[PDB]
Design a binder for this molecule. Structure first.
Ligand SMILES: OC[C@H]1O[C@H](Sc2cccc(F)c2)[C@H](O)[C@@H](n2cc(-c3cc(F)c(F)c(F)c3)nn2)[C@H]1O
Length: 138
């Protein structure tokens, strides 16, 4: 496969029990990946692996409102690897997005944007070959 940046419409927005699954392969020498769950121009949940931020690998999560980024949430568990296939699962729970990578729980992100049914697209960008992006209800 899919052309990146890729937009996945989320019809009717997100809801608890919605599971988003992304399969792809990290490019060689990758620098960054981003998932953006968007409410119009706002970013309800930005999930941003950085492969070299001051020679550290970190995942940064945040929300963008009226073009302003908020407080970053950082996770040093870093399950992505240059050149290698991955699976990202994002499960919407009532109070957070819950993210697992390669079947291992990674992080949770508390809902700051509370109008879940207005979060109706997911952007996928950065240094990946994107194989598939889909959703289902569990
Ligand atoms: O806080 C989160 C943000 O941090 C900074 S801005 C900032 C600085 C200090 C404190 C703070 F709160 C915010 C970044 O520049 C922000 N970013 C990253 C990408 C982006 C685009 C792409 F096309 C990709 F492919 C990609 F992987 C990432 N767009 N925007 C975002 O990550």
């Amino acid at each position: 496969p899919l052309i990146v940046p890729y937009n996945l419409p989320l019809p009717g927005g997100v809801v608890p029990r919605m599971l988003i699954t992304i399969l792809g392969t990290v490019k060689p020498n990758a620098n960054r990946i981003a998932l953006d769950f968007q409410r119009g121009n706002d970013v309800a949940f930005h999930f941003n692996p950085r492969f070299n931020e001051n020679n550290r690998r970190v995942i940064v999560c945040n929300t963008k409102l009226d073009n302003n980024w908020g407080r970053e949430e950082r996770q040093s568990v870093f399950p992505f690897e240059s050149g290698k296939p991955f699976k990202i699962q994002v499960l919407v729970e009532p109070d957070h997005f819950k993210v697992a990578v390669n079947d291992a729980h990674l992080l949770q992100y508390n809902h700051r944007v509370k109008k879940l049914n207005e979060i109706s697209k997911l952007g996928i960008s950065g240094d990946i070959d994107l194989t598939s992006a889909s959703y289902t209800m569990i």
